Amino acid sequence: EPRTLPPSPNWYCARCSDAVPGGLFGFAARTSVFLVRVGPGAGESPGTPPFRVIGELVGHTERVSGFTFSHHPGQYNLCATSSDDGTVKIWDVETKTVVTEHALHQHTISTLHWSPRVKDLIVSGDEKGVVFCYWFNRNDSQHLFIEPRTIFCLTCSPHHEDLVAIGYKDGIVVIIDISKKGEVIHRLRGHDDEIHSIAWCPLPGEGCYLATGSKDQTIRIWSCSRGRGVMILKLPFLKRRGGGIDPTVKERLWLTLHWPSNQPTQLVSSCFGGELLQWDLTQSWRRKYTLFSASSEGQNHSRIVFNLCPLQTEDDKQLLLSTSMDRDVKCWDIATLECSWTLPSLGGFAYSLAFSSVDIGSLAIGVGDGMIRVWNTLSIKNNYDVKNFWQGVKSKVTALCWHPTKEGCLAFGTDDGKVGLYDTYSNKPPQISSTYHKKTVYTLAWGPPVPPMSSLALYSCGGEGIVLQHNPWKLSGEAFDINKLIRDTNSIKYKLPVHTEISWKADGKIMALGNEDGSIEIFQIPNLKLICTIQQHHKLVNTISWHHEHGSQPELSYLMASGSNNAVIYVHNLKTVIESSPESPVTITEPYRTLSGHTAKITSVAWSPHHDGRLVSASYDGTAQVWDALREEPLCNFRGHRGRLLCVAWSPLDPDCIYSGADDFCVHKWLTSMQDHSRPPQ
RNA sequence: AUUUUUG
């Protein structure tokens, strides 16, 4: 079964996620909405949690700011989105297609809401105060304008088809009648800062009640009759739990609300640092609340929570899903207030994937949001067991490499040229090399030390073209540019080539360097004596990989796959040149194998540890291709990404499973057997 | 208030 590590739920949106009974959850993320099946219908083992990422609403060209399902029986498949691209779209989630849309707003849309009473009414609000009422299924629209203020949220009454509550940036809360040109029926005064959330009481009559949540740290309950406040709940200041959190990153309160139709005398809200509270409205003056996951530790959110969406499953479980700045989507069991499960998300390109050969299945992911992920992919009760590492990172993690033998030892490299060393078994900050790369760290590799270094050294390749040799025990010490050793050993006069890739042979006897001009150079230990130059690519080399040493034939370990900014992949066999061990280098100009098919640059190639000469490649053409390299046969093509692939890694235990990562902020785990397409698009 | 003209 495939898996998806999706883009992070968007931040600072009053309503950018929702859920329908059954059930289905949708959350805005970047330019799309992701769909997640929850409950019995997810078809999961009694061990693992019952959810699956099943869909994507694709079409917006800019940030999705709002999302809302229809909650009319028989039309749960319909939903609406707003976007910074200026449009409001109506979607059918069954087909994942646009039913109809409008571009009536001329200013940045703030939010929108599907009317609970009128089947085809979608009400949206923008930054200038303009409200549009949209009856999509009769082609109708009405503009309303109340106050010249920035709308933060709005919520149609669940009881009265004409009444809509609007909350503004300055704290104004109004209840308007859209049949009366938007006339203000109630002007609710009391809040001193942004309204983040408006929830109507699910029960009519006291009239009706409604609750507003504000950045001013108050939740206010109002009487819809007497147009005045009848209850003020102030958030409790609580001791920070769980997350050892980066203090510097700025973050103020987001106070969102959930008023359960299940239990009208309870009210759920967010709190400082992403805690969730269940308020007891009967004990108003005592300000009684119960903390979510107050018993368990490390289960609560670590940063502010933006959206809360109730979901009753068909086996009558009362769930509540929470989105958060901490990039976890959490599912809460209302009956127990415990976190049933957590779905991690990515806030940047997935630049890098590396499987530990020490802890099988431990998959490190280098992400553009400055956090290293470690996914225990073989966790039994959890398909998304992921730990985050943020200390000493900050920038985009563009390169990763596990140590060959030492548990928890993970090298990483960043977009600002930094090279660091993590002990993921600890929570101590990483050691950072004192020597920086001028540009992005594109590759990291462990290998035998070479002079003047004084059992394995760390090699790093940066975008400026230098390969550094670091002493993992002396990271604060100096790192050596191996170009000096190359130069001396090979007596070179002219300027050395710009190195763009480094890859050590599995035995650690041979080092291959890819260069910017397309050439690949083959050096042998201990002095990096050049024994061979390969001239095949004529653009920058992005990736090089040596076949493993446990195939049916030992000779296979001399197979070397390579990808560059051209779409064609080559395989070279260095048995002859390496065994002959020449005193002057050989120039190779003919490929041992030639793999054609992709239509864009190659970012990563990897050999299956389960087969002989089986290669997977990742390309900017948006696909990962699995080849029988020996036969030059294109076996299967994965097209699940919507962006350009940046990395790929074979599962260590499952010959059918591969992981890939792209600039769509997604990591996919997919099955070669579920892939019917044989080759890239042509 | 993160969401990359960027291997």
XYZ file of C-alpha atoms (C1' of nucleotides) in Angstrom:
689
model
C 0.000 0.000 0.000
C 1.317 3.425 -1.067
C 1.903 6.306 1.336
C 2.075 10.071 0.985
C 3.839 12.614 3.144
C 1.853 15.707 1.977
C 2.516 19.487 1.934
C 1.844 21.329 5.213
C -1.634 22.739 5.979
C -1.522 26.495 5.293
C -1.177 28.945 8.183
C -3.205 31.913 9.432
C -6.388 31.010 7.595
C -9.650 31.170 9.523
C -11.124 28.282 7.546
C -8.803 26.425 5.193
C -9.825 22.893 6.120
C -13.076 21.010 6.668
C -14.633 17.557 6.995
C -17.793 15.674 6.032
C -19.396 12.639 7.786
C -18.131 9.132 7.035
C -15.795 10.567 6.581
C -13.626 12.796 4.461
C -11.147 15.495 5.506
C -9.844 18.226 3.219
C -7.036 20.678 3.962
C -5.583 23.534 1.933
C -1.832 23.231 1.377
C 0.145 25.459 -0.938
C -1.900 25.732 -4.120
C -4.031 22.621 -3.624
C -6.442 20.898 -1.275
C -5.503 17.454 -0.028
C -8.147 14.824 0.650
C -7.802 12.284 3.481
C -10.203 9.400 4.093
C -10.835 8.787 7.783
C -12.571 5.881 9.497
C -13.559 2.309 8.516
C -13.535 3.395 4.869
C -9.765 3.918 5.014
C -9.355 0.140 5.173
C -6.557 -0.093 7.722
C -5.405 -2.890 10.044
C -6.723 -2.829 13.646
C -3.136 -1.978 14.624
C -2.418 1.005 12.364
C -4.503 4.235 12.488
C -7.560 4.483 10.197
C -6.680 7.194 7.656
C -5.363 7.445 4.103
C -4.359 10.340 1.840
C -6.602 9.756 -1.173
C -6.914 12.938 -3.180
C -5.840 16.340 -4.419
C -7.903 19.247 -5.719
C -5.578 20.811 -8.255
C -6.236 23.966 -10.257
C -5.422 27.034 -8.183
C -2.287 28.815 -9.369
C -1.732 30.578 -6.037
C -2.086 29.927 -2.292
C -5.408 28.377 -1.239
C -6.784 30.578 1.530
C -10.149 28.983 2.161
C -11.826 25.611 2.041
C -15.304 24.473 2.979
C -17.380 21.385 2.223
C -21.064 21.418 1.510
C -22.836 19.914 4.507
C -26.115 19.217 2.752
C -27.104 15.523 2.696
C -26.666 14.148 -0.817
C -24.082 16.802 -1.711
C -21.215 16.064 0.695
C -19.084 15.567 -2.427
C -19.269 19.285 -3.267
C -16.892 21.840 -1.748
C -15.515 25.346 -2.240
C -12.085 26.978 -2.209
C -10.780 30.508 -2.243
C -7.290 31.410 -3.417
C -4.861 34.291 -3.768
C -5.220 33.704 -7.529
C -8.460 35.678 -7.257
C -10.932 32.863 -7.793
C -13.530 30.959 -5.843
C -13.949 27.414 -7.149
C -16.686 24.819 -6.632
C -15.320 21.262 -6.731
C -16.704 17.745 -7.031
C -14.364 15.658 -4.878
C -15.593 12.432 -6.507
C -14.166 13.554 -9.836
C -11.679 15.984 -8.248
C -12.834 18.511 -10.870
C -14.110 22.103 -10.988
C -17.889 22.402 -11.334
C -17.873 26.163 -11.781
C -16.029 29.227 -10.485
C -15.972 32.996 -10.245
C -13.477 35.830 -10.009
C -15.783 38.469 -8.534
C -13.315 39.556 -5.864
C -10.781 42.226 -6.836
C -8.886 42.036 -3.573
C -7.174 39.212 -1.693
C -9.875 36.841 -0.484
C -9.818 36.217 3.254
C -12.193 33.322 3.646
C -15.392 31.616 2.539
C -18.193 29.429 3.863
C -20.755 27.079 2.362
C -24.179 27.960 3.766
C -25.607 25.228 6.024
C -29.171 26.197 5.006
C -28.999 27.095 1.323
C -27.762 24.259 -0.890
C -25.845 26.291 -3.455
C -24.864 29.407 -1.458
C -21.186 30.149 -0.869
C -20.350 33.359 0.995
C -16.826 34.778 0.687
C -15.052 37.766 2.198
C -11.900 39.659 1.283
C -9.245 42.018 2.608
C -11.129 45.222 1.684
C -14.395 44.175 3.324
C -16.135 43.060 0.164
C -18.463 40.105 0.663
C -19.785 38.021 -2.208
C -22.837 35.798 -1.932
C -22.577 33.147 -4.635
C -25.467 30.879 -5.683
C -23.416 28.608 -7.944
C -26.220 26.369 -9.186
C -28.388 29.108 -10.654
C -25.566 31.401 -11.759
C -26.215 34.185 -9.270
C -24.145 36.569 -7.198
C -24.575 39.524 -4.882
C -21.963 41.897 -3.516
C -22.292 43.228 -0.002
C -20.129 45.744 1.818
C -20.400 46.375 5.525
C -17.313 48.090 6.882
C -14.075 49.163 5.166
C -12.124 46.648 7.263
C -10.145 43.481 6.601
C -12.317 40.392 7.013
C -10.584 37.599 8.916
C -13.466 35.168 9.243
C -17.119 34.645 8.493
C -19.653 31.961 9.394
C -23.216 31.555 8.096
C -25.817 30.758 10.741
C -26.772 27.069 10.915
C -30.292 28.157 11.910
C -31.165 31.203 9.779
C -30.492 31.201 6.020
C -30.115 34.998 5.860
C -27.789 35.611 8.810
C -24.001 35.755 8.490
C -21.476 36.620 11.184
C -18.284 38.432 10.143
C -15.155 38.978 12.223
C -12.598 41.625 11.312
C -8.893 42.294 11.761
C -9.540 45.067 14.299
C -11.907 42.981 16.423
C -15.257 44.155 15.088
C -17.847 41.356 15.016
C -21.050 41.903 13.037
C -24.137 39.821 12.293
C -25.692 40.773 8.966
C -28.763 39.907 6.897
C -27.825 39.115 3.307
C -31.439 39.446 2.164
C -31.376 43.044 3.422
C -28.365 44.230 1.385
C -26.061 43.055 4.190
C -27.693 45.245 6.816
C -26.025 45.023 10.217
C -28.471 43.324 12.561
C -26.015 43.068 15.430
C -22.826 44.933 16.285
C -21.008 42.832 18.869
C -18.543 44.966 20.817
C -15.856 43.636 23.139
C -12.817 42.209 21.334
C -9.571 44.216 21.110
C -7.721 42.302 18.378
C -8.184 39.999 15.359
C -11.170 37.666 15.311
C -9.811 34.228 14.387
C -12.953 32.145 14.772
C -16.748 32.403 14.919
C -18.881 29.450 16.010
C -22.665 29.504 16.279
C -24.352 27.431 18.949
C -25.651 24.233 17.242
C -28.864 24.517 19.265
C -31.287 27.321 18.373
C -32.826 29.467 21.108
C -31.324 30.943 24.262
C -32.667 33.681 19.348
C -29.301 31.934 19.568
C -25.834 32.073 21.067
C -22.564 32.515 19.271
C -18.927 32.299 20.251
C -16.023 34.350 18.948
C -12.341 33.642 19.485
C -9.778 36.414 19.330
C -6.061 37.143 19.334
C -6.848 39.173 22.500
C -6.896 35.799 24.271
C -10.616 35.944 24.912
C -13.488 33.729 23.824
C -16.741 35.672 23.971
C -20.225 34.186 24.083
C -22.928 36.512 22.801
C -26.721 36.558 22.893
C -28.043 36.930 19.352
C -31.173 38.561 20.778
C -29.940 41.207 23.209
C -26.895 41.783 20.979
C -24.581 41.777 23.990
C -21.899 39.625 25.576
C -23.120 37.039 28.052
C -19.851 35.273 28.766
C -16.136 36.046 28.641
C -13.631 33.198 28.859
C -9.966 34.153 29.033
C -7.327 31.619 27.993
C -5.327 30.008 30.813
C -1.574 30.566 30.855
C -0.084 27.083 30.989
C 3.397 25.592 31.284
C 4.858 24.775 27.863
C 4.593 21.027 27.252
C 6.262 18.478 25.005
C 8.246 20.257 22.322
C 11.694 21.551 23.088
C 10.892 24.444 20.791
C 12.953 27.028 18.908
C 12.207 30.181 20.963
C 13.329 32.699 18.340
C 10.736 31.856 15.669
C 7.979 34.455 16.114
C 4.507 33.124 16.946
C 1.499 34.733 18.607
C -1.851 33.214 19.549
C -4.320 31.802 17.067
C -7.611 31.114 18.851
C -9.959 28.910 16.885
C -13.213 27.339 18.036
C -15.240 24.142 17.835
C -18.774 24.020 19.268
C -19.876 20.347 19.240
C -23.482 19.694 18.198
C -22.957 16.530 20.206
C -22.471 18.421 23.483
C -23.921 21.977 23.370
C -22.630 22.810 26.893
C -19.029 22.139 25.911
C -16.887 24.321 23.665
C -13.483 23.399 22.281
C -10.811 26.008 21.585
C -7.127 26.269 20.780
C -4.745 27.909 23.258
C -1.150 29.163 23.574
C 1.424 26.852 22.012
C -1.250 24.750 20.324
C -2.849 23.223 23.390
C -6.493 22.252 22.995
C -9.138 22.991 25.622
C -12.602 21.623 26.302
C -14.499 24.418 28.054
C -17.356 23.576 30.425
C -19.883 26.303 29.661
C -22.105 25.384 32.623
C -19.253 26.331 34.980
C -18.703 29.644 33.169
C -17.673 31.741 36.178
C -15.258 29.091 37.415
C -13.777 29.075 33.901
C -13.590 25.288 33.946
C -11.771 23.521 31.117
C -10.159 20.154 30.463
C -6.830 19.916 28.632
C -6.609 17.613 25.600
C -4.091 14.805 26.180
C -3.523 16.098 29.713
C -2.434 12.598 30.705
C -0.172 11.638 27.807
C 3.020 13.557 27.052
C 4.437 14.571 23.679
C 1.048 14.067 22.056
C -0.111 17.701 22.135
C 0.694 20.188 19.367
C 3.873 22.216 19.872
C 2.880 25.352 17.967
C -0.399 27.243 17.488
C -3.393 25.400 16.062
C -5.276 27.090 13.219
C -8.281 24.878 12.305
C -10.532 22.393 14.116
C -12.828 20.101 12.105
C -15.266 17.635 13.615
C -15.676 14.229 11.970
C -18.095 11.494 12.982
C -17.141 8.176 11.383
C -19.741 5.629 10.239
C -18.913 3.500 13.284
C -20.004 6.546 15.311
C -16.577 7.620 16.559
C -16.563 11.329 17.412
C -13.243 12.652 16.057
C -11.745 16.151 15.823
C -8.926 17.080 13.467
C -6.494 19.894 14.152
C -4.079 21.689 11.837
C -1.061 23.470 13.231
C 1.979 25.625 12.607
C 3.988 22.609 13.846
C 3.041 20.901 10.546
C 1.289 17.958 12.219
C -2.332 17.154 11.418
C -3.730 15.521 14.548
C -6.839 13.416 15.084
C -8.468 13.618 18.479
C -10.887 11.193 20.120
C -13.459 13.539 21.672
C -14.640 10.891 24.144
C -11.132 10.527 25.569
C -9.488 13.810 24.480
C -6.506 11.704 23.435
C -4.683 11.928 20.114
C -5.680 8.925 17.986
C -3.080 9.613 15.325
C -0.810 12.174 13.727
C -0.081 12.857 10.069
C 3.237 14.700 9.481
C 3.606 17.172 6.623
C 6.362 18.877 4.630
C 6.885 22.627 4.419
C 9.476 22.558 1.640
C 10.863 20.659 -1.351
C 11.917 17.126 -0.366
C 15.520 17.576 -1.428
C 17.067 14.458 -0.057
C 16.337 10.867 0.973
C 18.754 8.504 2.710
C 18.119 5.078 4.251
C 20.264 4.009 7.187
C 22.123 0.764 6.495
C 22.437 0.455 10.288
C 18.807 0.908 11.339
C 16.876 -0.653 8.474
C 13.918 1.432 7.320
C 15.112 4.549 9.124
C 14.632 7.095 6.353
C 16.150 10.563 6.707
C 14.534 13.349 4.644
C 16.097 16.715 3.808
C 13.365 19.335 3.457
C 13.239 22.976 2.376
C 11.602 24.085 5.655
C 14.818 23.667 7.641
C 13.869 20.494 9.485
C 15.370 17.046 9.062
C 12.771 14.273 9.093
C 13.509 10.753 10.260
C 10.779 8.363 9.221
C 10.769 4.932 10.860
C 9.166 3.446 7.793
C 8.886 -0.047 9.290
C 7.041 0.990 12.449
C 4.281 -1.573 12.947
C 1.432 0.475 14.465
C 2.140 3.691 12.546
C 2.682 4.263 8.825
C 3.956 7.774 9.614
C 6.349 7.451 12.543
C 8.343 10.638 11.972
C 10.726 12.551 14.257
C 11.748 16.156 13.544
C 15.195 17.695 14.045
C 15.541 21.489 13.939
C 18.556 22.321 16.124
C 21.553 23.758 14.259
C 19.769 23.477 10.913
C 17.712 26.600 10.010
C 18.291 26.543 6.250
C 17.071 24.207 3.502
C 18.527 20.716 4.002
C 19.761 19.934 0.498
C 21.930 16.920 1.292
C 21.954 14.001 3.756
C 23.986 10.877 4.429
C 23.829 8.291 7.208
C 27.128 6.980 8.561
C 27.862 3.443 7.209
C 28.199 1.827 10.666
C 27.561 4.256 13.527
C 23.944 4.320 14.759
C 22.211 7.706 14.830
C 25.088 9.396 13.034
C 23.598 11.510 10.263
C 25.542 13.993 8.135
C 23.577 16.887 6.610
C 24.214 19.828 4.285
C 22.284 23.024 3.611
C 21.541 25.584 0.926
C 23.877 28.079 2.611
C 26.853 25.727 2.359
C 26.764 24.402 5.913
C 27.859 20.868 6.806
C 26.710 19.333 10.087
C 26.608 16.089 12.013
C 23.595 14.871 13.997
C 23.285 12.217 16.650
C 19.614 11.359 16.179
C 19.750 9.026 19.180
C 20.246 12.171 21.274
C 18.626 15.587 21.517
C 21.914 17.470 21.703
C 22.413 20.068 18.944
C 24.455 18.862 15.950
C 28.171 19.446 15.551
C 28.785 21.935 12.749
C 31.855 21.944 10.512
C 33.773 25.224 10.801
C 34.552 25.116 7.072
C 31.584 26.199 4.934
C 30.817 25.735 1.243
C 30.355 28.986 -0.710
C 27.224 27.545 -2.288
C 24.613 24.818 -1.726
C 25.777 21.468 -0.346
C 24.663 19.137 -3.105
C 26.275 15.893 -1.928
C 27.573 14.094 1.178
C 29.416 10.789 1.202
C 31.383 8.795 3.734
C 34.683 7.374 2.598
C 38.251 6.445 3.483
C 40.343 9.399 4.643
C 43.055 10.687 2.283
C 46.157 12.810 2.993
C 46.598 15.040 4.813
C 43.712 13.737 6.944
C 44.546 11.902 10.163
C 38.222 5.251 10.302
C 35.986 7.107 7.852
C 36.053 10.740 6.743
C 33.097 12.855 5.620
C 33.118 14.209 2.069
C 30.962 17.179 1.053
C 30.387 18.635 -2.406
C 29.205 22.214 -2.832
C 27.721 24.076 -5.783
C 30.796 26.248 -6.249
C 32.692 23.091 -7.205
C 34.802 22.198 -4.181
C 34.880 18.839 -2.445
C 35.813 19.065 1.249
C 37.134 16.280 3.480
C 35.953 16.681 7.084
C 37.173 14.915 10.201
C 33.971 13.727 11.930
C 35.788 13.808 15.280
C 37.325 17.213 14.620
C 34.504 19.158 12.979
C 35.607 22.430 14.568
C 38.993 21.719 13.024
C 39.865 22.467 9.416
C 38.426 20.664 6.400
C 40.659 19.977 3.413
C 39.985 20.749 -0.245
C 40.894 17.463 -1.954
C 41.836 19.403 -5.102
C 45.296 19.980 -3.602
C 45.850 16.233 -3.289
C 44.391 15.560 -6.760
C 46.616 18.264 -8.265
C 49.759 17.001 -6.527
C 49.146 13.313 -7.259
C 48.361 13.894 -10.920
C 50.711 16.849 -11.614
C 48.037 19.135 -13.060
C 48.718 22.655 -14.403
C 45.472 24.139 -15.708
C 42.439 24.913 -13.526
C 40.760 21.821 -12.044
C 37.165 21.109 -13.129
C 34.178 22.277 -11.098
C 33.021 19.226 -9.077
C 29.237 18.766 -8.910
C 28.874 15.216 -7.573
C 30.926 12.750 -5.567
C 30.208 9.022 -5.220
C 32.356 6.384 -3.506
C 32.513 2.818 -4.815
C 30.858 0.362 -2.409
C 34.266 -1.078 -1.439
C 35.671 2.389 -0.708
C 38.579 1.949 -3.127
C 37.339 4.214 -5.890
C 35.945 7.751 -5.870
C 33.980 9.157 -8.776
C 33.602 12.909 -9.253
C 31.001 14.337 -11.586
C 31.810 17.757 -12.984
C 30.012 20.785 -14.416
C 31.235 20.074 -17.961
C 29.680 16.609 -17.878
C 32.870 14.632 -17.412
C 33.205 12.061 -14.636
C 36.611 11.310 -13.135
C 37.643 8.040 -11.491
C 40.232 8.171 -8.692
C 41.772 5.362 -6.662
C 42.901 5.399 -3.040
C 45.007 6.392 -1.173
C 46.129 9.473 -3.123
C 43.295 10.084 -5.602
C 45.343 9.023 -8.609
C 43.309 9.602 -11.759
C 42.888 6.308 -13.611
C 39.984 7.174 -15.883
C 37.947 10.021 -17.339
C 34.467 9.432 -18.747
C 33.156 11.746 -21.456
C 29.470 11.065 -22.080
C 27.301 13.776 -20.555
C 27.838 17.259 -21.945
C 26.005 19.035 -19.149
C 26.500 19.229 -15.355
C 26.481 15.858 -13.587
C 23.692 15.742 -10.983
C 23.965 12.178 -9.813
C 26.230 9.137 -9.697
C 25.570 5.736 -8.129
C 27.651 2.559 -7.840
C 25.868 -0.807 -7.940
C 25.871 -2.821 -4.689
C 28.102 -5.829 -3.955
C 25.574 -8.577 -3.163
C 24.193 -9.449 -6.589
C 24.490 -12.789 -8.382
C 27.608 -11.605 -10.230
C 30.447 -9.778 -8.437
C 31.304 -7.935 -11.665
C 28.114 -5.897 -11.200
C 29.827 -3.920 -8.442
C 31.789 -2.135 -11.204
C 28.584 -0.781 -12.695
C 28.194 2.989 -12.382
C 25.006 4.873 -13.259
C 25.008 8.599 -13.967
C 22.566 11.405 -14.637
C 23.071 14.998 -15.716
C 21.084 17.990 -16.990
C 20.413 16.063 -20.203
C 17.543 13.581 -20.101
C 19.548 10.523 -21.139
C 21.106 8.303 -18.467
C 24.308 6.336 -18.862
C 25.778 3.258 -17.248
C 29.527 2.630 -17.411
C 31.426 -0.547 -16.512
C 34.768 0.164 -14.916
C 35.919 -3.425 -14.394
C 38.589 -3.235 -17.098
C 40.055 0.170 -16.263
C 40.047 -0.412 -12.490
C 41.609 -3.878 -12.737
C 44.263 -2.784 -15.256
C 45.232 0.102 -12.934
C 46.971 2.356 -15.528
C 49.877 4.754 -14.864
C 48.227 7.344 -17.087
C 44.419 7.792 -17.116
C 42.132 6.314 -19.771
C 39.479 8.370 -21.512
C 36.210 6.481 -21.925
C 33.860 7.875 -24.572
C 31.344 5.042 -25.039
C 28.606 3.972 -22.598
C 28.218 0.391 -21.404
C 24.456 0.980 -21.284
C 22.234 3.834 -22.472
C 18.876 4.570 -20.822
C 16.652 6.914 -22.853
C 13.106 7.971 -22.001
C 13.020 10.985 -19.688
C 12.377 14.376 -21.250
C 14.120 16.549 -18.652
C 17.133 16.692 -16.328
C 18.048 13.743 -14.121
C 18.375 14.594 -10.403
C 18.951 11.209 -8.829
C 19.630 7.595 -9.715
C 19.610 4.587 -7.395
C 20.213 0.848 -7.756
C 17.785 -1.683 -6.335
C 19.479 -3.644 -3.534
C 17.077 -6.493 -4.389
C 17.912 -7.070 -8.046
C 20.771 -7.215 -10.524
C 21.234 -4.048 -12.553
C 17.855 -2.554 -11.704
C 17.901 1.225 -11.620
C 15.426 3.882 -10.587
C 15.877 7.435 -11.783
C 14.226 10.687 -10.764
C 13.679 13.427 -13.322
C 12.503 16.991 -13.738
C 9.895 15.555 -16.134
C 7.825 14.779 -13.039
C 8.262 11.016 -13.074
C 10.406 8.290 -11.559
C 11.470 5.567 -13.995
C 12.467 2.014 -13.100
C 14.765 0.365 -15.671
C 16.346 -2.973 -16.328
C 19.729 -1.341 -16.987
C 21.437 -4.434 -18.403
C 18.609 -4.931 -20.911
C 18.174 -1.174 -21.333
C 14.528 -1.983 -20.605
C 12.147 0.690 -19.163
C 10.122 -1.354 -16.620
C 7.785 1.097 -14.873
C 6.993 4.798 -14.592
C 5.632 6.585 -11.485
C 3.692 9.779 -12.175
C 2.150 10.527 -8.771
C 4.171 13.708 -8.210
C 2.880 17.044 -9.469
C 6.331 18.591 -9.364
C 9.907 17.970 -10.419
C 11.560 14.988 -8.702
C 14.670 15.744 -6.677
C 15.375 12.430 -5.000
C 14.625 8.732 -4.973
C 15.531 5.764 -2.745
C 14.653 2.056 -2.902
C 12.973 0.463 0.117
C 15.436 -1.763 1.952
C 12.970 -4.588 2.710
C 10.472 -4.483 -0.133
C 11.611 -4.981 -3.765
C 8.310 -3.505 -4.946
C 8.500 -0.293 -2.901
C 10.281 2.939 -3.756
C 10.328 6.376 -2.091
C 10.627 9.595 -4.098
C 10.669 13.324 -3.323
C 9.924 16.423 -5.369
C 9.479 20.204 -5.244
C 5.776 19.606 -4.685
C 6.551 19.255 -0.953
C 5.638 15.534 -1.219
C 7.384 12.316 -0.380
C 5.674 9.340 -2.042
C 6.048 5.698 -1.144
C 4.840 3.761 -4.188
C 4.695 0.185 -5.499
C 6.400 -0.760 -8.758
C 3.680 -3.409 -9.153
C 0.908 -0.796 -8.974
C 2.548 1.043 -11.851
C 1.087 0.096 -15.224
C 2.828 2.794 -17.328
C 6.086 1.436 -18.728
C 7.958 4.574 -19.740
C 8.022 8.330 -19.142
C 5.558 10.478 -21.091
C 6.771 11.077 -24.651
C 2.467 35.176 8.021
C 6.439 29.605 6.155
C 4.740 27.792 0.798
C 11.802 28.483 -3.410
C 13.307 32.069 -11.452
C 17.315 27.266 -7.435
C 20.304 19.602 -8.948
